[PDB]
Amino acid sequence: NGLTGTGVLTESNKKFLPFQQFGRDIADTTDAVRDPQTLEILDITPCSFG
Amino acid sequence: FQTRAGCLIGAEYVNNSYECDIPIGAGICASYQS
Amino acid sequence: ETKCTLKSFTVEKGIYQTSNFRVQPTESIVRFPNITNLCPFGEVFNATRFASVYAWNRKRISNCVADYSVLYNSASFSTFKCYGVSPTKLNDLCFTNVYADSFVIRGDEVRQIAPGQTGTIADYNYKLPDDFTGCVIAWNSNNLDSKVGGNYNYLYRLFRKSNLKPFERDISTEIYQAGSTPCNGVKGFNCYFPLQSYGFQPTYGVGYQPYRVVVLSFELLHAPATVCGPKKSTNLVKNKCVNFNFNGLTGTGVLTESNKKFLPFQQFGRDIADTTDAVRDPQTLEILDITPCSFGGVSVITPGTNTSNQVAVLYQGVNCTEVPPTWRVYSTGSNVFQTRAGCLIGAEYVNNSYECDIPIGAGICASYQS
Amino acid sequence: FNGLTVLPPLLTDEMIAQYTSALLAGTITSGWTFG
Amino acid sequence: QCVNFTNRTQLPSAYTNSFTRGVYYPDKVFRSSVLHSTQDLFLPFFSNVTWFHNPVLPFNDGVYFASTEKSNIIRGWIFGTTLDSKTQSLLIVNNATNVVIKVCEFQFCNYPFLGVYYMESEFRVYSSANNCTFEYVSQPFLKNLSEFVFKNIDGYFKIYSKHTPINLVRDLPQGFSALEPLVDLPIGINITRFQTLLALHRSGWTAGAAAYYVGYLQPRTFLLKYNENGTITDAVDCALDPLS
Amino acid sequence: SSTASALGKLQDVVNQNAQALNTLVKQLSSNFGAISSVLNDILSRLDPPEAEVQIDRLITGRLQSLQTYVTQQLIRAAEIRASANLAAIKMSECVLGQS
Amino acid sequence: EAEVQIDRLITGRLQSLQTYVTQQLIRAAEIRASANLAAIKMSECVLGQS
Amino acid sequence: ICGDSTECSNLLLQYGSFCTQLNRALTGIAVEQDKNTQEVFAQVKQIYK
Amino acid sequence: ICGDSTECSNLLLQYGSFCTQLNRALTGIAVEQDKNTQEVFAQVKQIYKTPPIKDFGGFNFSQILPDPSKPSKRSFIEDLLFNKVT
Ligand SMILES: *[C@@H]1O[C@H](CO)[C@@H](O[C@@H]2O[C@H](CO)[C@@H](O[C@@H]3O[C@H](CO)[C@@H](O)[C@H](O)[C@@H]3O)[C@H](O)[C@H]2NC(C)=O)[C@H](O)[C@H]1NC(C)=O
Ligand SMILES: *[C@@H]1O[C@H](CO)[C@@H](O[C@@H]2O[C@H](CO)[C@@H](O)[C@H](O)[C@H]2NC(C)=O)[C@H](O)[C@H]1NC(C)=O
Ligand SMILES: *[C@@H]1O[C@H](CO)[C@@H](O[C@@H]2O[C@H](CO)[C@@H](O)[C@H](O)[C@H]2NC(C)=O)[C@H](O)[C@H]1NC(C)=O
Ligand SMILES: *[C@@H]1O[C@H](CO)[C@@H](O[C@@H]2O[C@H](CO)[C@@H](O)[C@H](O)[C@H]2NC(C)=O)[C@H](O)[C@H]1NC(C)=O
Ligand SMILES: *[C@@H]1O[C@H](CO)[C@@H](O[C@@H]2O[C@H](CO)[C@@H](O)[C@H](O)[C@H]2NC(C)=O)[C@H](O)[C@H]1NC(C)=O
Ligand SMILES: *[C@@H]1O[C@H](CO)[C@@H](O[C@@H]2O[C@H](CO)[C@@H](O)[C@H](O)[C@H]2NC(C)=O)[C@H](O)[C@H]1NC(C)=O
Numbered sequence A: 001n002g003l004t005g006t007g008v009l010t011e012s013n014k015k016f017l018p019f020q021q022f023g024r025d026i027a028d029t030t031d032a033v034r035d036p037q038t039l040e041i042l043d044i045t046p047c048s049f050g
Numbered sequence B: 001f002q003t004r005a006g007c008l009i010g011a012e013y014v015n016n017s018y019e020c021d022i023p024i025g026a027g028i029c030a031s032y033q034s
Numbered sequence C: 001e002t003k004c005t006l007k008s009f010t011v012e013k014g015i016y017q018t019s020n021f022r023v024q025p026t027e028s029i030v031r032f033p034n035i036t037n038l039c040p041f042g043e044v045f046n047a048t049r050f051a052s053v054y055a056w057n058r059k060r061i062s063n064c065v066a067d068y069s070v071l072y073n074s075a076s077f078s079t080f081k082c083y084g085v086s087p088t089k090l091n092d093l094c095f096t097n098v099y100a101d102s103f104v105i106r107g108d109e110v111r112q113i114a115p116g117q118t119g120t121i122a123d124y125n126y127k128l129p130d131d132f133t134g135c136v137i138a139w140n141s142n143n144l145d146s147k148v149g150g151n152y153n154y155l156y157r158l159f160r161k162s163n164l165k166p167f168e169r170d171i172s173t174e175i176y177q178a179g180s181t182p183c184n185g186v187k188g189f190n191c192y193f194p195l196q197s198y199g200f201q202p203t204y205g206v207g208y209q210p211y212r213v214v215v216l217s218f219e220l221l222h223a224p225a226t227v228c229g230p231k232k233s234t235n236l237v238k239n240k241c242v243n244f245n246f247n248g249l250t251g252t253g254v255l256t257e258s259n260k261k262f263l264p265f266q267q268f269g270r271d272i273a274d275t276t277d278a279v280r281d282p283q284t285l286e287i288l289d290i291t292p293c294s295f296g297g298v299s300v301i302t303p304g305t306n307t308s309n310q311v312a313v314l315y316q317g318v319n320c321t322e323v324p325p326t327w328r329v330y331s332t333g334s335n336v337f338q339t340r341a342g343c344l345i346g347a348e349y350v351n352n353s354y355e356c357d358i359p360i361g362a363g364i365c366a367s368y369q370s
Numbered sequence D: 001f002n003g004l005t006v007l008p009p010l011l012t013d014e015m016i017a018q019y020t021s022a023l024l025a026g027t028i029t030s031g032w033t034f035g
Numbered sequence E: 001q002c003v004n005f006t007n008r009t010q011l012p013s014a015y016t017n018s019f020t021r022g023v024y025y026p027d028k029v030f031r032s033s034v035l036h037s038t039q040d041l042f043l044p045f046f047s048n049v050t051w052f053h054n055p056v057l058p059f060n061d062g063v064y065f066a067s068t069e070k071s072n073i074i075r076g077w078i079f080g081t082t083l084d085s086k087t088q089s090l091l092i093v094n095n096a097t098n099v100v101i102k103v104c105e106f107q108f109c110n111y112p113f114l115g116v117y118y119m120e121s122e123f124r125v126y127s128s129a130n131n132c133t134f135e136y137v138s139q140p141f142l143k144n145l146s147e148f149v150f151k152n153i154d155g156y157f158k159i160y161s162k163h164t165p166i167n168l169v170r171d172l173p174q175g176f177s178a179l180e181p182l183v184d185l186p187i188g189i190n191i192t193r194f195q196t197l198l199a200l201h202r203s204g205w206t207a208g209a210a211a212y213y214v215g216y217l218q219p220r221t222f223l224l225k226y227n228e229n230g231t232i233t234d235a236v237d238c239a240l241d242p243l244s
Numbered sequence F: 001s002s003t004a005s006a007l008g009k010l011q012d013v014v015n016q017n018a019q020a021l022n023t024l025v026k027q028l029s030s031n032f033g034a035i036s037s038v039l040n041d042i043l044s045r046l047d048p049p050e051a052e053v054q055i056d057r058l059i060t061g062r063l064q065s066l067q068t069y070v071t072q073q074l075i076r077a078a079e080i081r082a083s084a085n086l087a088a089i090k091m092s093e094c095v096l097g098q099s
Numbered sequence G: 001e002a003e004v005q006i007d008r009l010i011t012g013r014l015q016s017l018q019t020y021v022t023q024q025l026i027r028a029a030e031i032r033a034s035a036n037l038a039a040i041k042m043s044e045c046v047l048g049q050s
Numbered sequence H: 001i002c003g004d005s006t007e008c009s010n011l012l013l014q015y016g017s018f019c020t021q022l023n024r025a026l027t028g029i030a031v032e033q034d035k036n037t038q039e040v041f042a043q044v045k046q047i048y049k
Numbered sequence I: 001i002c003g004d005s006t007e008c009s010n011l012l013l014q015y016g017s018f019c020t021q022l023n024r025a026l027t028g029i030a031v032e033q034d035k036n037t038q039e040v041f042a043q044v045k046q047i048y049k050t051p052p053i054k055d056f057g058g059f060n061f062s063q064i065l066p067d068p069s070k071p072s073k074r075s076f077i078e079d080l081l082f083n084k085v086t
């Protein structure tokens, strides 16, 4: 929905309040999104590097 | 082999214990004998 | 000098670094290849026929002496705009493998011939590179490239599957499928011929009259040079810090007969960080090496302005054989001395040794008695 | 993270505790002689 | 003036090791006793190289051609896209006299060759050449290991050469030798395929000992060493080994 | 006499100084966004109304490099001074008397 | 205009990174001094009577 | 500073080696921390009980 | 920064006194090194000399005392240390 980014998407147990669209934790880092078609709470994790 | 520092390939893991030569991490390191 | 650089009318007994000195250059040396011949610019400019936009004519220029004064003084060029170099220095440089691309376009599209420009011909006919170097010349050709019957010989592209790479040429006149249904080589709906003709007529006003455009593209020191300017060479002098311009490579230093070996294809050489340490003259084909003429810092030794007004000048890391910040007064008959720190002028060496005042370096220290 | 990494220390806390235990046992039993 | 044949000779194209050959001077700048890291097109170390005991092969980025030749049997070279008069092609002939380089819309037949007479007078490689611009004549290029590198970059055709005395029987020597630049051509073509020409004794063609090594280049990074005399004596590949 | 690599501290200090100087002098060969890394060429090519911009880019890049080098030198000098003070103390007690 | 915008971004991130590195260096030097003091104190006091 | 972007990497390429000298300090810092711990604690040759 | 350019020098002059303090810091560092060496080594007021005949109860210091033969007047251990590092 216009928010772009690279990572791995998993299922999450976070419960958004019914009006948000995407969450974050700290320092402006997105961690969960809601798919507009299905309205399901997902989780975003940066895929491994080193 | 898998270590708390990461994954190490090319060198085998033994059960012995000697003085540390080339530090690796998490309390383990490698040496030449292979 | 110390009073000026320390901002006080009183200076205590001590050593103070004031400035640095350099050996000034004398005269100049210009060296260019002996080859000379008038360069063929008439044919590329005074051409009876000019190709289309999608078939721009590319010509290579090499092994010639080019005079850019005639291409700049003439007012027949409506637009003469350069990017990489100022037009006044065109005759002061030497290049190799010059390229000239000539064509004819409409008056309103002359603005599209520029790096990072988006348009019809700037994107689908002839795309200039973003880092282009060289010049662009455009002029009016209504009286010759426009006829009362209309010129249909000039064809330009309008439809293309994708964009064009820099300095790319496309000539394929393939049918374009503008819709979901393929044309299969048949003209029809969602099918258009990619080429279209100009409507050049003398009745048209400014901006619609045909314009002739030539683009000159250069290189910057990537190979042995072959296209030099109208400058004349001169003789060379060695063992003197002079200014040199070897085939476009400018610099200042002292030249010496080198001892390194160049393979028959090599031109010059360097060791670390663009330090050109050897050159081959285009005329004699002889090897020379370049080193900067001497320079270094200068410092003073004074016993304090309260005691006296006598100073001793030390030049750091400079051989005492050559020294004359002019201050020629300390060059006539004053006492001189040489040490590992450099050269000392104004102090007299004494053989005795004892615990001493102000130091200089390398175990040698000065004091007041002179 | 965001391109920053944290490297683990070479000596684990268990080895540090073992050093401290050995030092303390030595100073209790021997004194300054083991130094 | 060329006709078809019947003896469809098939070259037993084997595979062998590239070892550490195919290193050339990248620039025209003199350096002495220094280690220089440069990224360019090179033949990767320890690669597959094809050995022929005359098919059509692709050009790709560049071509490395080697010959442990006796008496210099190999003569010519043909480059192009479709090898016909429709598209401009390039031809190189190194006979007993000055070498000739041409770029023209030649009409190659199935089995082009020079042909010699036993006092040789024969030239029947192609049939026609209608429109073309550039020609060049130089001194001839050529028991001995001859190495050549053909590169096509920025409308520039670079030919680098090196001749070396050899004594080993079959395999490539396990040594290192730089390749000095030989010829630069400021002509741009869409070359994608190339051939090889033989000096068969036409009196009945007899050319069976036509063996050569062919390899392809790739872009990568090398670390070269320049000695006190400015000659490359050692090179190290980057993307080959963690130690490298 | 026999075993080597027993003087690691001084050797690494010298190596650090040498590599710092080497990278400082190597930084001079960067475009920093301009058209050339050599100032005489850009002076000889184009009009000073743009040479000012190009030389400004070169100046800011080289100023950044020089400031970084100076800061590193200051830190290293502070560490060396601390080590020298420790060495002077050790010479004071251990040599001139029993510790 | 994209190279100009990217230039602004990269240069600003460059001063940020340089400042972070400098602060890390200063803090590391101070910690090293503290560690040397601790080692000395542990040398004389633990292993003998001071 | 680029976030896996080709244009950003190309633009950064013309800056020289700030990154090498930057990375060359963190490794020294980490080695210094390891040496600090080793010299502070490893004051004995054996392990007593 | 400028490498003998009048235009570059004029352009740099309007940036203010940036590098003057850098030169001052470098000079201070050099003076600090000289002071460090002097204060580390100059611990004595005079210069002493060992007697020509040496009988120290059995101890042998020949490897540490300077050798008159060498013009550098550096002992064996000092020579080895100087030769090892380069
Ligand atoms: C230089 O030569 C290459 C030869 O490969 C040109 O690339 C294109 O190669 C294809 C071969 O697959 C040629 O055939 C075409 O294939 C496409 C896709 O299958 C097909 O739709 C076409 O009908 C045709 O059969 C293609 O002609 C060729 N492109 C051109 C423009 O000839 C490459 O383009 C050449 N470059 C230049 C600058 O001439
Ligand atoms: C999104 O549009 C689709 C199109 O029909 C619908 O999604 C279906 O919704 C029903 C119940 O609402 C589910 O049982 C189906 O599994 C869904 N998917 C499909 C493919 O039928 C619905 O109109 C919209 N879904 C929303 C708004 O959640
Ligand atoms: C194209 O032709 C014109 C006219 O013949 C050339 O203009 C001449 O230039 C020379 C050199 O400056 C002058 O001495 C003549 O007086 C000019 N002739 C006229 C009629 O003005 C022009 O130089 C030619 N183009 C090129 C590139 O040489
Ligand atoms: C200053 O320059 C002169 C000449 O260039 C040096 O004199 C030479 O010294 C070397 C040995 O140092 C001799 O081998 C040469 O024969 C000398 N040449 C001449 C012409 O005298 C002089 O040494 C230099 N100054 C210093 C301090 O080295
Ligand atoms: C086709 O060409 C091949 C290769 O030149 C010929 O094979 C050679 O024949 C001669 C004649 O006896 C032998 O001495 C060689 O040893 C053969 N070479 C190989 C590799 O086998 C062959 O004879 C020719 N055939 C015809 C019909 O001309
Ligand atoms: C480098 O080039 C020289 C000059 O041709 C080669 O010749 C050597 O030159 C040195 C000093 O001039 C002599 O001591 C050698 O005896 C010469 N050797 C030969 C074979 O002529 C030299 O061989 C080349 N290579 C090296 C490694 O120096």
Ligand SMILES: *[C@@H]1O[C@H](CO)[C@@H](O[C@@H]2O[C@H](CO)[C@@H](O)[C@H](O)[C@H]2NC(C)=O)[C@H](O)[C@H]1NC(C)=O
Binding pocket: I060, I061, I062, I063
């Ligand atoms: C002190 O030690 C040195 C070094 O061993 C002794 O010098 C050696 O003396 C023996 C016997 O005279 C010689 O064979 C060696 O060649 C000497 N070594 C050197 C390096 O000169 C010296 O004699 C010892 N002095 C005393 C008083 O024991």
Ligand SMILES: *[C@@H]1O[C@H](CO)[C@@H](O)[C@H](O)[C@H]1NC(C)=O
Binding pocket: B013, B014, B015
């Ligand atoms: C190390 O010891 C463990 C524990 O008994 C055993 O399972 C393992 O096989 C041993 N590995 C080796 C290489 O001795």
Ligand SMILES: *[C@@H]1O[C@H](CO)[C@@H](O)[C@H](O)[C@H]1NC(C)=O
Binding pocket: C034, C035, C036, C283, C284
């Ligand atoms: C080449 O240069 C030399 C020396 O400058 C000169 O004497 C000679 O005439 C020149 N030859 C040609 C063909 O320009």
Ligand SMILES: *[C@@H]1O[C@H](CO)[C@@H](O)[C@H](O)[C@H]1NC(C)=O
Binding pocket: C306, C307
């Ligand atoms: C400066 O010289 C005068 C003249 O003898 C002397 O009286 C005075 O003490 C000197 N100043 C200092 C600071 O010694």
Ligand SMILES: *[C@@H]1O[C@H](CO)[C@@H](O)[C@H](O)[C@H]1NC(C)=O
Binding pocket: C349, C350, C351
């Ligand atoms: C100092 O003594 C040396 C003896 O080697 C002599 O050559 C020199 O002239 C003396 N200097 C003066 C100023 O007398």
Ligand SMILES: *[C@@H]1O[C@H](CO)[C@@H](O)[C@H](O)[C@H]1NC(C)=O
Binding pocket: E015, E048
């Ligand atoms: C490539 O090299 C390998 C290694 O010897 C060999 O087995 C193989 O036949 C060669 N050719 C191909 C096409 O893989």
Ligand SMILES: *[C@@H]1O[C@H](CO)[C@@H](O)[C@H](O)[C@H]1NC(C)=O
Binding pocket: E095, E096, E097, E098, E099, E100, E120
């Ligand atoms: C060799 O090639 C040259 C150049 O084309 C030609 O003049 C000559 O006739 C050819 N043949 C011989 C035997 O030289």
Ligand SMILES: *[C@@H]1O[C@H](CO)[C@@H](O)[C@H](O)[C@H]1NC(C)=O
Binding pocket: E130, E131
């Ligand atoms: C030369 O080129 C023209 C057009 O490019 C072509 O029509 C012609 O067939 C070619 N050959 C000859 C001999 O004219």
Ligand SMILES: *[C@@H]1O[C@H](CO)[C@@H](O)[C@H](O)[C@H]1NC(C)=O
Binding pocket: E071, E143, E144, E163, E164, E165
């Ligand atoms: C082989 O190459 C060498 C170059 O060292 C040359 O002298 C020789 O004439 C060539 N030919 C033969 C048959 O050796």
